[PDB]
Scaffold this active site. Sequence first.
Site, short mmCIF file in Angstrom:
data_model
loop_
_atom_site.label_atom_id
_atom_site.label_comp_id
_atom_site.label_asym_id
_atom_site.label_seq_id
_atom_site.Cartn_x
_atom_site.Cartn_y
_atom_site.Cartn_z
CE1 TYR A 255 1.32 -0.24 4.46
CE2 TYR A 255 0.38 1.97 4.21
CZ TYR A 255 1.12 0.92 4.82
OH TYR A 255 1.70 1.08 6.14
CG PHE B 11 2.11 9.81 7.29
CD1 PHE B 11 0.83 10.42 6.67
CD2 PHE B 11 2.31 9.42 8.05
CE1 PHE B 11 -0.41 9.51 7.25
CE2 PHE B 11 1.21 8.35 8.68
CZ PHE B 11 -0.01 8.67 8.35
CG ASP B 12 3.63 4.46 6.12
OD1 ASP B 12 4.70 4.08 5.62
OD2 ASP B 12 2.86 3.56 6.30
CB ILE C 177 -4.48 1.18 13.44
CG1 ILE C 177 -3.09 1.77 13.95
CG2 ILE C 177 -5.60 2.29 14.00
CD1 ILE C 177 -2.78 1.96 15.42
CE1 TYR D 29 -0.66 4.98 16.07
CE2 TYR D 29 -1.48 5.56 13.89
CZ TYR D 29 -0.66 4.73 14.61
OH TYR D 29 0.07 3.80 14.37
CG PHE E 172 -4.74 4.56 5.02
CD1 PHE E 172 -5.20 5.00 6.21
CD2 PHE E 172 -3.34 3.88 5.55
CE1 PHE E 172 -4.89 5.41 7.52
CE2 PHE E 172 -2.73 4.21 6.84
CZ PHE E 172 -3.49 4.91 7.59
#
Lengths: 107, 97, 377, 755, 194
Positions: A26, A36-37, A56, A82, A99
């Site tokens: 992903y 950020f990922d 999560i 979070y 995502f």
Amino acid sequence: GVEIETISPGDGRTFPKKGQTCVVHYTGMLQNGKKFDSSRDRNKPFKFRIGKQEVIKGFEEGAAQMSLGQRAKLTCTPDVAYGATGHPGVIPPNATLIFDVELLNLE
Amino acid sequence: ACFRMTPLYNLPTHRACNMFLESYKAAWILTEDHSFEDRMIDDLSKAGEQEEEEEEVEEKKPDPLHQLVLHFSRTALTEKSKLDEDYLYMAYADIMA
Amino acid sequence: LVYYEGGAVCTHARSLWRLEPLRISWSGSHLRWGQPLRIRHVTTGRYLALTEDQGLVVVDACKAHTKATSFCFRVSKVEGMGPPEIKYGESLCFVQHVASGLWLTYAAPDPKALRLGVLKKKAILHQEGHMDDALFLTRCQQEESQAARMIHSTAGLYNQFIKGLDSFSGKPRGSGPPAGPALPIEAVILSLQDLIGYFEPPSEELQHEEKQSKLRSLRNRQSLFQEEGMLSLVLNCIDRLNVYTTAAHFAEYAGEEAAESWKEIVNLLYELLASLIRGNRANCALFSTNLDWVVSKLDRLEASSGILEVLYCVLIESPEVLNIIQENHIKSIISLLDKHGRNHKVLDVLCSLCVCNGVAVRSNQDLITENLLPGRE
Amino acid sequence: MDILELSERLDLQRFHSHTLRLYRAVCALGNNRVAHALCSHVDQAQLLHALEDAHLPGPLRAGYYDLLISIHLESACRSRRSMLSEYIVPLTPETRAITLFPPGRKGGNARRHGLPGVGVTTSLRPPHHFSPPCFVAALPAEAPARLSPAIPLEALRDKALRMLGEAVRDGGQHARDPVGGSVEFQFVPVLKLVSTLLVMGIFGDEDVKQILKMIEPEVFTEELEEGLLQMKLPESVKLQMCNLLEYFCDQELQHRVESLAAFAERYVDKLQANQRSRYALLMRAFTMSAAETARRTREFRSPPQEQINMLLHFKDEADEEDCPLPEDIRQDLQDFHQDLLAHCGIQLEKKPQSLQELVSHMVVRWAQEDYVQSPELVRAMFSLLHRQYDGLGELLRALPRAYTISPSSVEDTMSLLECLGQIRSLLIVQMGPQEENLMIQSIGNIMNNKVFYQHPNLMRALGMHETVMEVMVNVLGGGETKEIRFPKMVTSCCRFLCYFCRISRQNQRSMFDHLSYLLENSGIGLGMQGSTPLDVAAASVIDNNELALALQEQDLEKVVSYLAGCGLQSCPMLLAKGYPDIGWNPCGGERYLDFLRFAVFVNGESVEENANVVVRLLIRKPECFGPALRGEGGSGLLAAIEEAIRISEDPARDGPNRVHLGHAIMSFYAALIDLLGRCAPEMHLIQAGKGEALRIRAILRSLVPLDDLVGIISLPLQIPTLQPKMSASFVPDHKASMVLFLDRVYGIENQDFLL
Amino acid sequence: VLQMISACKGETGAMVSSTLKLGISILNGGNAEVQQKMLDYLKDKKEVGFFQSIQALMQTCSVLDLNAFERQNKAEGLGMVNEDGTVINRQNGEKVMADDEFTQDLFRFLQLLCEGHNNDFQNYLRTQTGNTTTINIIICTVDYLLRLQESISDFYWYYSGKDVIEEQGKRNFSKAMSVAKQVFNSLTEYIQGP
């Protein structure tokens, strides 16, 4: 509070269940348009097992609703990932998550 | 006690080796290499300024030893409270003597 | 009051004395036994006397009418150069008051607390004295002696400025008549411009030996200007001046003729204080209690060069002050980058909050990561 | 905007240049917590893409190489570098075959040194641990703030060497715009990465045989591309070359000690076997001549180490031989010791054809053709040729760090070695509450490894007692008693030191030498329990009987001066609880005096030289005595304790220590007389045949009257009945300190025993 | 070597010991030329910096103590530990002097300075002109050859009542007398060449 929007059709029949391995190659972004990922940049298929809560809850419950080969758009509420403190140094407190998730094989 | 000390032939192999090395400091500590003492200041320092130099005007390029001592003079003048150990200084101070 | 002390003040300006003979001509001639003379303290600018009852008191330069001071030297108990008699370090002269004929020695009344507390004794002109005076003299006539009268002149010119400045602390001007006594401005501007040049750091093109030699002659003088105040004094001026905010317009009720000379005076103190701190280590420890005060401002439209440089020099030497930042000083300097643009100087300062000389601290090596880093603006 | 155009702004580049310096600064000396948070910020890909990129502004991306080396490495390099000094080697079958290139034929015995670094080392080193970043993982709340970031080491190794392959070819070709702007940007950042990967030993066998081919003509061709040591270079890359050549010297040294271990195995084996044969030849079988039994004495008498000296002396000696061995095992030493003193430096009376010749002939050239500035450089090469000219000197200074162990225990030591590393990383970092937790389990796991009980010689060679010592001094370093930050760790660590001191005599000596250092910062932070640095100071000499004779007076003098303090202070920390604190503190005094008890006697009322000077020194300061007696006001021999008894059952007076105050007063005076009962002159061995000791006996007898002393043994409090008492008042268990005070000072004589 | 000694104020560590060992080798014999260079620098730098070290250093030199001797005399009574390689220290000479290998060279260094009847060091050591303060090494060395004298005479009384001096009563004794001879040699070389 998760929303799912299909982007490309998948098998539509085989869905992951408990006690089964899932690989997710992903990428991930933030609500404002910054990412950020990622996993494509590292070129390693991220793999995880459902049921032991090593990921999560929002991500796993989102992935539970998609089939093999499907690429979709996922949107988590800040209360599910979070919530208040967040992960220090990467994400600000009380932020919405975005995502881009697709599943390679193994259901 | 001295009357009950153990014979050598009952010691474990691993332990009976460490005593050998520590006791066998009787072939280096007495042997002398000499060597680096007279051949040191000969090849270094003297004959340092070889035919590599092509031209000069007023001064001369310091020979290899000259850099060494001024370095110790350089670190000596450094504004400090107490001198450090610098075993490197010991290694060269003795061989110059 | 007069005291005695061991090998602590022996390298300090406090223990320096000047001898002034009573003649006007040939005052610099050789000093000989049996000759009246006065004694002057250099940085205090005062003489020594015993007037009627107070003891060997350091009297000012206005009540020393050649009878209260009246000192001379005794061996035991001329229009020329003169015969050279008294040597350095072995003359063993004895001090004696002329009018009273007494001998100087230490009373040394020490209680139990005084013996284990302050190692200090008081000298008195006893009638017979002790047997262990043997006062011998040592010569220190060098660059430090020149930097002794400077303390008295500058410290006598500064406090008078603040004291005059302090008179109109809270009185709006009665437009027209500005105030009473005037203030000196041309004097101080020249004065400050000298010390910054005087304390100017060693150059770069000089060789090692010359650079090292002067590096010892700068650290000493920097410490020599702390033991006589002059750190509180420069701090005190900032406290009084910094009350007047905004610009010279609010400073109007102090004399509008001096308003246009406001910015430079405010500026000149700051890099002066940087000279007294840069390089030296002992002075840097003093700001641990005053750390909150310097970090407070960081906002005046005419302080940018001064404050960022004074803060930079106190976090490069002392790791102790580095450990006295809790949670709010970090975001204050962070906000500085947000209001004064993209300045590489501030970013360099944040690197100082990181690992110090060898040792690294983790109590604050996460706050910048969670405050100036997660936001991506 | 594009990064490539920042080479033409000169102001936005300057800001961004310092930005990547902050990231290097944020990753402090080990900060695996915040290190990963940068991974999501900077990259994982464009760093690996910045390598092959050539268009380069200079102080920019060429500086990324110093960021790639900071977020993935020096998490083990900073630890594995410390691991390179000690050379622990185990008994392994692989170790049984190590020599000087034994495929050599005739000339290969005296030549063919072998390429420096091939393999088979058998040294014990901890393995690197790495973890992959994942920010979608569940919220944790184990590893210290985390284990480490990961990276594909396989890609880095091949890419780095291929990259450097271009460098050598491109340097010889010349240019008017080198990569990065000026030659040195094209060399220093890229080969610095090579050096860091080299110490971890990522390269193996084949790989290092190519890095040597970059200096091909001399080192290579064991069976065009000009070497790196052929062309002129600036005064910065030359420094890095020294950092690269330095790694190869100790690789030969590490190879050297392993060869000795190989000889330290087969020769000791036959020695033990042949010595048994020497037994039965002269055992019970025996023969005659009587005096032959006197000759055979090493064989049953003397400690085992003494036997080795006798049997090894003649082997490598010259000419004279005493009590020799068969002339069959005394030939390999004269070959091995000859073989060793042909490899290192010995002559034993063009192309260098050897590393020794190559380095020595090269460093001289660099100085002859330049006047080297940057003193940090000149210190580098001068530490090289000294090593290459004094081979045995390095070897002689390396053996005291070498040790051999046996299999089936390496796994136990492996845990100890890996666990010990975290202590070394604790010293550099300033003390933190999270880091404070880490050590307590760290030290707690040290004292369970089954290896810190069998081989104490290791732990003095690793010397963790040295390293742990600075840990205590940093936390305790403070202006006054208010600087007691981070308690509960001095107690948790000082307990470990005491048990270390009670394992062997040499362990007692090694830490004893720091006694003056320890007492300097011991008598300030008083008030806690469990332990204190004063306790380990006392435990440093308890049963030696020769360490006590090796005191230096000033140590005893300075501790006495501490006791002068507790005779006039008021214990402000004790006062802070709102306590009377009338004249002095007995709590502090009872601790200093407990130390002196262990320095007057060692084993059954002996050693008087230090005891003699204690009484002559203690008398000089009369304030050392509690002001209740030995003063000008009054003494109250049977009243001072009686006064304490009155305050014992007075809860109002007390303090309205953790129990009461009267017990503390009783503890002091009872302990003081206990000191001056064993500080007695001596037993009657000396007191009945000399006149010096009688002087001391008269002094101490004149300070404690017998009339009051005899009466003090009376008045017991009570006995549990119906309900026991409390250990807060003046008990009776600690009244035996007056029994020994009369047993060896005044003693029984006439018929007063009845009274 | 003058620059190296001056940096080390008063700590007799391994630093100066390996440095003073060097200085003897340069100026053995008379070596007039090397003395001239050393004098010129001291007249040029014109800082004290060095005579403070020499004055302070030699005041830390040891003498023949007697209390420390007794500590050996019973420690030598034992011969071996229960079972640990016997007494590893064996001699363990560090006690009575532990400095003769060093303090004997400090005075030799001073003596060789005023060799060949040089009449500038023989005058400079008495008083340093210019500078700020003087040290007067001459009177600063005679005091040492008075405390040492009070030590040997003290040692004599301890053996006055015995009849034969044991082997360890002579090994330490000859150590002290050898040092005293070296000091006496120096005192002559401040006076020779009037």
